[model samples]
Target: SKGEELFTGVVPILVELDGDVNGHKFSVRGEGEGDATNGKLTLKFICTTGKLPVPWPTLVTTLVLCFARYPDHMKQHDFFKSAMPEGYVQERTISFKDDGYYKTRAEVKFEGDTLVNRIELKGIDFKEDGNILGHKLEYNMNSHNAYITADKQKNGIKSNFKIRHNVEDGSVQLADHYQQNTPIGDGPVLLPDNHYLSTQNALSKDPNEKRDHMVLLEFVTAAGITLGMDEL
Candidate 1:
C-alpha cells in the first residue's frame, strides 16, 4: 500500500500476448508508447512465437484468436477510462488497393454493434526489430509502416493495427504498405471493446455466401502502472 507514498503516473511498460488460430499458438510481445490521458496510446507489436499467417482474408481468424483471449484486461481498461477517459476505442478496417484504385474488402463490426457502438479505426503495426515475426515470417512486413496509427495526437493507450488487401482482384498476396489514419473517440468514457472476428463459413456451394465471416477488434492493456489527474 503506497497510498501515503505518492506515485504519479509513472510505469509505462512493455508487454506481450498469446493467441492461437486454428491450433496455431502464437505469441506477440509488445508495449505502450503513451498514457491514458489524451492524444493517443499506441500498442506496438514487438515479436511473435513464429510466422504469422498471411493477414488478409485470414486476418479475422487471427484477430478472433486474440479477441476471445483479452476480456478482463479489456474491462480494466474501461476502469481507467471510467475516470481517466482518454484512449478511444479502436476499429480495424479491411480495404483493397491496386494501382490507381482503392476499395474495401468490407467494413467490419463486432457483436453486431453497427448501431450500438461506433469509433475510429486503427491498424496494428509490427516494429521491425530483430525479434519481430521471428525469422521466416519477417519478409511479409513492410517494416515500421503502421496503417492508420492514431489521430492528430495522443488520446490514450492501447491501440491496434488495420489490415489492407494490397493484392489485386481478391488475390491472396499481402498488404505490404501501411499508410496511417483512424477515427476519433467520444469526448468521454468510451464504449466496451466489442470487437468481432470470424464467423460461420456456411458456404453451401456459393463462394459468396461465406460473407458472414468478418474481422474486427478492440483490445486494452494495463501498463505496469496507472496514472490519474488529481489537482492535489
Candidate 2:
C-alpha cells in the first residue's frame, strides 16, 4: 500500500429531513455533536415537516371541533372562546404562556440535572402569514407545546382527561385537551424524529372512560453516544 490514512470517528452528521407543506416541498437541518458527557448531551431539533406560521387563532376553532366530537363539553369551550387557556384556572391547568402572548402555541423545556420538563402555551392569535396549528390532527404535533419528565413512567407519573365546555357564552363546546403518547429522551439525544406526528395519541388515554387522553414523557440517553472519563 502507498499510504494508510484512516478517517476514524466518521458518522452521520447534520441529518436532514424533508417534507411537503402547502403543496411545496422543503427541508430542514438538524445537526449536533454525539459526544455525550455527564450522562447527557444537548440536542437541537428543527421541525421540517409541518412548520407553519405562528400567531394563528387556530386553537379556538379547533376546540370547537373537538367539542363537536365529544358533545358534552360546553363551559370549558366557552371559556376558551372568549379568554385564553391561561388566567382562568391555576392548578387545574398547566400552560406555556411565558409572556402572555398567543403568537405561538406551546414550547418545551427540559432540564437534565433536575430531570424535569415543562410545556407552555397561552392561546392562539391571528397572523398575516398563515395558521400555526398545534396538537390538532392534520399536523398532529407532540413536542411543539409539551415536554415529558425523565423516567416518568418508572417514577409513576401519569395523568387523565375529560370533556368540558362553557354555556354562558354562545354554547362554546370543547373536548378535554390532553397530551398523549409523547416520547422523551434524556440528555441531548431527543425523541426519534419520525414519532413527532402521532405521538400524542400513542402515549395516553382519557380519564372519564376514554373521554380524553394523557401522556407521560420519559427520557433516556441514546445508545452508542458514550461519555468520557473526565466528565463522569
Candidate 3:
C-alpha cells in the first residue's frame, strides 16, 4: 500500500476524464494555467446523458475554482506530510460568490518519482462549462504501474474512469474507441462562434483584458480577407 510517488516533477497541462455516475454518463476536462507545478486551473464538465435529481444546471455558470502549491501549509498537517517526499502538494478549492455560493476541495500527493501518486476532490456544485453531475472523485496510480483509476459518484450513482500510460515514452495513452454504452448525440455539439457571448464574460477580470487584445488581433486578421485588403 506504500511506495514512491509517480507524479512528483510532472507538470500537468490538462486532464480529460469520462465515466458514469448516478446512472448518468459524464465527461470532465481540467486545464491548468501558468506553470503546471503551481498555477490556477479550471474544470470543464459535460453531462452526456441521464437526468439529475437536483438543481445542477446553475453550477456551470457559478463555479469559481482555483488551485496552487502549498507545501509549508500542507506540512503542518499529518495526513499530508506522510506523502511529501518531493515536498509539495497542489491544493484546489472552489467558491461561486460571483455566480452564487458553493464549496469544494482537492489535494494531490506524490513521491520523488513516478511510483506513488494520487488525487482527490469532494463537495461540489460545479466544473467549467456545465454543472458537474457528480458527488466526489478520487484517482490513484496503482503500485504495479498497471493503470490509473478515477472513481466518482453522484446521488448514489458511481463511475470508474481508467487511464493507461507509457512511463518510458513519457506519453499518456487512452482508449481509442467510444466508452459510453449509449451515445448522447450523433455528433459534437456546435455553439455560436461569437466570443463575447460567453468567452469575454466568463473570463477572469485580469485574463479578460489579455484575451480582449487577442480577440482584436483575430478580428483584424479576418477583416483583411472580407475587405479585399492585400496581405501585409
TM per model?
0.27, 0.21, 0.24
- Model 1 earns a TM-score of 0.27
Model 3 misses residue 13 by how many Å?
Answer: 4.1
Whole-model lDDT values for every prediction: 0.27, 0.23, 0.24
**Which candidate number has the best lDDT?**
1
lDDT by residue (tens digit), candidate 1, 1-232: 1110111232233333344333444454433333222212233342254554333232322221111122333333232233221222333333322211111121112222111122222233332321212122211222122211223354432333444332333333243322221223344432333232212221112245232221212222222222366354
Among the numbered candidates, top TM-score falls to: 1
Global lDDT of model 1: 0.27
Q: lDDT tens digits, residues 51-135, model 2?
A: 4332111222111100111111212111111211111111112122221122212211112212111222343332223222222
Question: What is the lDDT for 127 in model 2?
Answer: 24
Show the lowest summed lDDT stretch of 10 residues, model 2.
61-70
TM-score of 3: 0.24
Candidate 3 residue-wise lDDT, 1-232, digit = tens: 0111222343333333333323334333433321222323333332223333223322222221112222322212122223333222232233332221222222232223222222232333333332223212111121111111111221111112222322223433231111111112222211111111001112222343322111110000000011245454
Candidate 3: worst 10 consecutive residues by lDDT?
A: 216-225
lDDT for model 3 comes to 0.24
